[PDB]
Amino acid sequence: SEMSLIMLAAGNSTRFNTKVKKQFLRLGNDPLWLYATKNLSSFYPFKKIVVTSSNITYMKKFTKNYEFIEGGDTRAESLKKALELIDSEFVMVSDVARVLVSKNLFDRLIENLDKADCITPALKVADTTLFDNEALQREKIKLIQTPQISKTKLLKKALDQNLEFTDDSTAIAAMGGKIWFVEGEENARKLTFKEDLKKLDLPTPSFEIFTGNGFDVHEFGENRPLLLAGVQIHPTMGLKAHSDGDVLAHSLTDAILGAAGLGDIGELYPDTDMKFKNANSMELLKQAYDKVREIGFELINIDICVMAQSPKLKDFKQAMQSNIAHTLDLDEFRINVKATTTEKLGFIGRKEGMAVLSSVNLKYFDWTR
Amino acid sequence: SEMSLIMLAAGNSTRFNTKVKKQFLRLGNDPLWLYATKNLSSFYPFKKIVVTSSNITYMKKFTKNYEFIEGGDTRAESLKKALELIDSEFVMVSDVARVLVSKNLFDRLIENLDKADCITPALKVADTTLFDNEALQREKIKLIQTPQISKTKLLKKALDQNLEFTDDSTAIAAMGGKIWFVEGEENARKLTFKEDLKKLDLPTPSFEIFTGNGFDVHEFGENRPLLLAGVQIHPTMGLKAHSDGDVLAHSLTDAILGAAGLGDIGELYPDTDMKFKNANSMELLKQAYDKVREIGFELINIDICVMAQSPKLKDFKQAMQSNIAHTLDLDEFRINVKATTTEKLGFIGRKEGMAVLSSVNLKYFDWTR
Amino acid sequence: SEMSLIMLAAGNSTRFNTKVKKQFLRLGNDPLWLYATKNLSSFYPFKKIVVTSSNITYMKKFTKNYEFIEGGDTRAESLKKALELIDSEFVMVSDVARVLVSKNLFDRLIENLDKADCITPALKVADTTLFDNEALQREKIKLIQTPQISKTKLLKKALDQNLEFTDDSTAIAAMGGKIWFVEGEENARKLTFKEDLKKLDLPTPSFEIFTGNGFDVHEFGENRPLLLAGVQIHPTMGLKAHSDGDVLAHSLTDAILGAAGLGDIGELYPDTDMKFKNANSMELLKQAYDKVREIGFELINIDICVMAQSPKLKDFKQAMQSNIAHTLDLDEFRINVKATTTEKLGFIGRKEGMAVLSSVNLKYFDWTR
Amino acid sequence: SEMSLIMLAAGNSTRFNTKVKKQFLRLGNDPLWLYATKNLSSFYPFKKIVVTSSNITYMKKFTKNYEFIEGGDTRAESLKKALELIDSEFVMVSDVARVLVSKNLFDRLIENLDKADCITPALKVADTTLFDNEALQREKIKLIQTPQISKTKLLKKALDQNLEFTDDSTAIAAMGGKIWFVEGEENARKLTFKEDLKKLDLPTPSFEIFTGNGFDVHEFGENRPLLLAGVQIHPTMGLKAHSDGDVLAHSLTDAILGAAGLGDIGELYPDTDMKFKNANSMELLKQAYDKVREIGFELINIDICVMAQSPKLKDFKQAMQSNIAHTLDLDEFRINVKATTTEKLGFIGRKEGMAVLSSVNLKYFDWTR
Ligand SMILES: Nc1ccn([C@@H]2O[C@H](COP(=O)(O)O)[C@@H](O)[C@H]2O)c(=O)n1
Ligand SMILES: Nc1ccn([C@@H]2O[C@H](COP(=O)(O)O)[C@@H](O)[C@H]2O)c(=O)n1
Ligand SMILES: Nc1ccn([C@@H]2O[C@H](COP(=O)(O)O)[C@@H](O)[C@H]2O)c(=O)n1
Ligand SMILES: Nc1ccn([C@@H]2O[C@H](COP(=O)(O)O)[C@@H](O)[C@H]2O)c(=O)n1
Ligand SMILES: Nc1ccn([C@@H]2O[C@H](COP(=O)(O)O)[C@@H](O)[C@H]2O)c(=O)n1
Ligand SMILES: Nc1ccn([C@@H]2O[C@H](COP(=O)(O)O)[C@@H](O)[C@H]2O)c(=O)n1
Numbered sequence A, B, C, D: 001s002e003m004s005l006i007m008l009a010a011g012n013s014t015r016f017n018t019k020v021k022k023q024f025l026r027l028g029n030d031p032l033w034l035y036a037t038k039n040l041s042s043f044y045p046f047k048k049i050v051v052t053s054s055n056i057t058y059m060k061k062f063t064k065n066y067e068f069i070e071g072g073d074t075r076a077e078s079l080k081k082a083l084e085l086i087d088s089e090f091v092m093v094s095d096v097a098r099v100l101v102s103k104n105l106f107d108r109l110i111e112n113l114d115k116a117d118c119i120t121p122a123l124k125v126a127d128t129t130l131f132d133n134e135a136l137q138r139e140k141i142k143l144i145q146t147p148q149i150s151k152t153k154l155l156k157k158a159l160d161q162n163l164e165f166t167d168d169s170t171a172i173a174a175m176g177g178k179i180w181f182v183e184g185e186e187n188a189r190k191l192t193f194k195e196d197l198k199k200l201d202l203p204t205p206s207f208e209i210f211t212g213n214g215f216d217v218h219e220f221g222e223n224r225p226l227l228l229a230g231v232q233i234h235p236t237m238g239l240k241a242h243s244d245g246d247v248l249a250h251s252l253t254d255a256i257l258g259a260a261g262l263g264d265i266g267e268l269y270p271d272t273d274m275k276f277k278n279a280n281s282m283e284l285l286k287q288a289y290d291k292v293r294e295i296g297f298e299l300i301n302i303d304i305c306v307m308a309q310s311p312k313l314k315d316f317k318q319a320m321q322s323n324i325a326h327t328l329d330l331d332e333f334r335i336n337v338k339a340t341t342t343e344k345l346g347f348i349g350r351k352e353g354m355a356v357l358s359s360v361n362l363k364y365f366d367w368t369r
């Protein structure tokens, strides 16, 4: 009979993590989770394809071809929830972090479908093996891999109570089910540690570059320091409300989120109830960039235009640039701040307020390092 | 004596066409027609170089080295018109779609200049050949290629009345002229079908990325639905005139045309006579992007800033993004819509109107697929 | 004992120079001077690293790891000044233009440290050698290279009066010091002539692209020609002050400087004393782009939005584009000028002034040519 | 203080084995054991280099740079015997089957020399791990690698009685010694299974081809079947002694052994005591080729000249060729048998005996497959 596919792509491991989540590393044009799913999907006409996710909203923006379901607290819980979507006799289950699974291994699992309740790849070990620094008999060791094929009904039953299983074979085996072991492959290794990247022949990120714009206006008339990019410009010529009033930081935040497709500052820091009154805007900026780095992006450069009749920003431009660099952990040369008056024209010219235009270019994080 | 060059680059075949015209596929930094012309031009100090074109204005922006002439209804008509520019004894004529013509083939044609009235490459065929599904004697078949060298005066005379000839050899032969056949080459194949691309070793497009900006202002005070990116925001708080009043769609159209070097919305859809009063702005947007795709470009991403005191766009941002994606046949994650008020300042703050800032990044279409 | 490093990177030779300074050619992500310094620095735990520079402000934006010092009028003067920073027994000195110095050559110099006062690589010559077109005995010729290691105290003394020495070995030798010659290498060649590039296996520039924005406002009400991008739009509807009043050229200048991290127009052409009253703004634009080319950047494209109620720019857009292209020595297709009114809203709508928004994309100059 | 090196290269595992022993696979020009030893030897000026071996005579023919010692029944026994050759404070020990150990890993072990009694690389495991098909906690697993550095005196003591240890860390630890674990590397993997080859980036065998000659003479005058290449030529015109009298098979055996540097038939099958009287010569041939395959060689072709006045071999040549092919598991086209008389001249011409000249070309076994 027929087979469905569950791709396990939820949870957030710190084991690997730089600031970037491993599921959003770019392989060619595709985020890793999509690359892995596309790969396995190409092997077989699955009845249904399910992806477990901790970021459904974001992932849905990348395809219309799969069913997404919110992950659970463990692999086995994400799996159990996704199984309720499956009604085919068989289900293939795979870690997304096993990216380069070959058609060959797939065929080897498929050709053995009727031999057992669960079919899984495995590798032997020829190294001395220590458990808790004490020697084990290495010949009796199996390292288990994925994809794994199971009878759907049995795997469902297998996960009725125990959600601790790290794979499907131990789950099925613990209820008396039979396992068929198939030889595994180095291409089915699981990306877990930062050091695993160079052990795999992964496609490097595409060269696409994303543009962001930011525009913001604050009003003059608050008796407090004027802070722009966290730098004091004037002791008393402050702007009203919006935390510490840093229109620059706010405009720049919008550009960075915009280039990454992550909305705007009001969606990230909803300030309608005056919740952010005491916020440091440069910290808000830093946290917004953290969000952008999590999904696999990196800044190339920043260019800014401050529109203000007064005060003159000339003596502060290098310091603003340097503070932005430090906040975002960027080299200083990548930041530029400009200014113009409006020749005493309009609301800006009347000194009623000031505006800031920001432009940003983002590329994909180069995990090649 | 001396030789001129006519590059035949007019007409618009649907035989190949995706949305992109084959003459504007990027090979390195150069559009295909320019790459092919540069290639042949490098072989010989031609007295004159003529290019027939259906897009003279656009092509002229790429070089000052050639004479351009408007094409005709057929190859032979474009050729006939271009010949009126030639006064040298000999003329080399070539399809631009034959991109990788070697110096070797050129020399082989040149060394045989005095043997006949027209010198042309040709290939034999060893496959079974059917004409209308009936077998022909394959040994008697010649597949003709280009470049072809002819005595100018004879080719002019050859095209006096009959404009149906698909090459120069049949034209010259039909008036009793003699043809010299030279062995052809796989590198002189004509790009005709989408499938031909992988049969040629063409240079892949450069990684250059083009920026576009768009800014537009519409006035409040029309009692109709507020439509932004084709999405209804408010039932009555509409903007005046400009079709359905979609300032967003209009700003975005400007950014896309701007990045492609194609002017602005008023040049593409002149609306001075109220001609577009009933237009769907999102359809106008789609058609503008079609123009950009025709000349070899593709969108990477879109970022937008709506400047409006009211209404609040928060609940509509995902829908606007999704409608832009659907209209432009782009993945949703590549679109971002932001908003800000101006703190009740200026014409925007007074609710007299609203403005939209758009940014776009365009790359060259990757015909590699 | 211990060793410091002096990288010699000051002065501006026209011997090589296109418009680009050789120290700012991009090798991967790094400017050449930084690439060379990083390379040598990786060979040894130097006590101190000094770089002589004619652009300290700019270079400091790229790293915090080195000490920078202003160069002198000659190599030997830059060296002498940098030596006052060194207190270790030994100093390695190297031309930055010798980019690909191998770890191998380094070891060969280090292993011979105690043999003499100065250790230097050298190559023999097997070609016929002419001095002033008269033959010399080629077997007696040495071509000297860098890095060179010297006893710090001796090299200091060596440069007490004579600042004409082109290397450290002749300096040390002229005071009776001993030189140890070590075999050199083709990888230690000095980039001097444009033709040297293809003789070295240098890493090609990265594909990063930098965004720039420009926004400027001028006021109406001066009875003079309206010049935009150096093109006369109107005989009398001029803008006030700012040289010839070309807001477009001024906005575009800001975008180009901004993308390159070079400040804004007021920092480059301070006009507070009415110094630029008679300037041609398009010449100012050209000179600003020259600055950007000096540090290794090149324009991909320009997109512009003119915000003006009047006059209509339609009939002038192609001419503006063409004049910008000619001024910047760019192909015409890379320039686009758009326009919009503000529906009679705000200061622009009242015809009190006009504004110009510019966007630019810059890439690294491709010295591969 | 100082360090010696022990390369462990004895024993004959069938785990990997085709007919070829893994220590004699060719990597470039070098057998694997020599390639691995050369690699590690290049990292450090070891006081002494010891190689344990089951083929000392053969290995000694490849270098004069190492001390060879006969292996024992286990890794630990070979190690224990080799240690009696070491008097330096430290000893590095390594499996030869870990071929591509990097200089990097070496440095990491060396920099930690004083931290413990034994320094070893190790890798963590992120796969589900079964011991006897039951799940273990994968986080507590270490896979141990080589090289391993130990204090010589302690490792000697560690191996006083127990010769079962599969590595040096468990040996040292079992006597209360301390272990320092250093991160391992995929390049230090141990070639164990045929499938491991494609997991390593090993240098492919050189293209050297080895010539062999064989010449043999048997005497006529025995009343028995004439067998040549195991094929009956004549029912009664037999040759005297030498097993079944097959001079052809005997000559060919000499050529194959000769090309491989393995002596001659009398050294392999000493027949002075009439021990081989009942042998099948084609089986002896097959076994001689097995020896040649064990050391990494493979036949390209065989050419033979039989010198015999009678009988005529014409009708038997294809059958002889085919029987040689079957015996040696070679494609038939690679075998050729020729014949000539001597015009009734000499001992052959008098029909006193017959001679066989053989030529063979051997290449290195292409383990790439
Ligand atoms: N709560 C979780 C945890 C992990 N997973 C997925 O299960 C796979 C295996 O993860 P571990 O190696 O962390 O067990 C990963 O692909 C991970 O994304 C999940 O879907 N839900
Ligand atoms: N017309 C508008 C204006 C603002 N907004 C939202 O409200 C937030 C706060 O707006 P101000 O910056 O104008 O205070 C913005 O970041 C944006 O999320 C909106 O959705 N629609
Ligand atoms: N009206 C036309 C049609 C084709 N051509 C050119 O003639 C060449 C041959 O086109 P066909 O293969 O479509 O005949 C092409 O390079 C095409 O661009 C032209 O210059 N004018
Ligand atoms: N100053 C101006 C303003 C508008 N225009 C043109 O007029 C068109 C319509 O302008 P509005 O969008 O302001 O209605 C623009 O798209 C542009 O082509 C111009 O050429 N010069
Ligand atoms: N005044 C100068 C001149 C050259 N130099 C440096 O000295 C090195 C050798 O330059 P010449 O080949 O021009 O002598 C170059 O790396 C150059 O940058 C310097 O530091 N100060
Ligand atoms: N608020 C401001 C406005 C202008 N400036 C500087 O003054 C210069 C001239 O300003 P105008 O273009 O507004 O005349 C700008 O190029 C910028 O260098 C500034 O430093 N701070």
Ligand SMILES: Nc1ccn([C@@H]2O[C@H](COP(=O)(O)O)[C@@H](O)[C@H]2O)c(=O)n1
Residues within 6 Å of the ligand: A126, D008, D009, D010, D011, D012, D013, D052, D053, D071, D072, D073, D074, D075, D078, D079, D094, D095, D096, D097, D166, D190
């Ligand atoms: N009796 C033995 C067995 C193995 N060895 C060597 O020890 C190393 C490890 O072998 P095992 O993986 O078989 O334990 C191999 O390099 C092998 O050649 C040895 O020197 N003497």
Ligand SMILES: Nc1ccn([C@@H]2O[C@H](COP(=O)(O)O)[C@@H](O)[C@H]2O)c(=O)n1
Residues within 6 Å of the ligand: D307, D308, D309, D310, D311, D312, D313, D314, D315, D338, D339, D340, D341, D342, D343
């Ligand atoms: N014992 C022999 C001798 C010769 N021959 C064949 O007879 C041919 C002629 O032999 P002479 O060169 O010895 O005349 C050889 O080329 C070979 O084909 C044979 O088959 N068996």
Ligand SMILES: CC(C)=CCC/C(C)=C/COP(=O)(O)OP(=O)(O)O
Residues within 6 Å of the ligand: A345, A346, A347, A348, A355, B215, B345, B346, B347, B348, B355, B357, C345, C346, C347, C348, C357
């Ligand atoms: C990209 C930019 C900056 C576009 C211009 C939008 C803007 C800030 C208009 C201000 O109106 P106003 O100052 O003319 O209002 P007022 O009627 O008070 O003069």
Ligand SMILES: [Mg+2]
Residues within 6 Å of the ligand: A339, A340, A341, C216, C217
């Ligand atoms: Mg200004």
Ligand SMILES: [Mg+2]
Residues within 6 Å of the ligand: A216, A217, B339, B340, B341
């Ligand atoms: Mg705001």
Ligand SMILES: [Mg+2]
Residues within 6 Å of the ligand: B216, B217, C339, C340, C341
């Ligand atoms: Mg408009």
Ligand SMILES: [Mg+2]
Residues within 6 Å of the ligand: D339, D340, D341
């Ligand atoms: Mg003969």
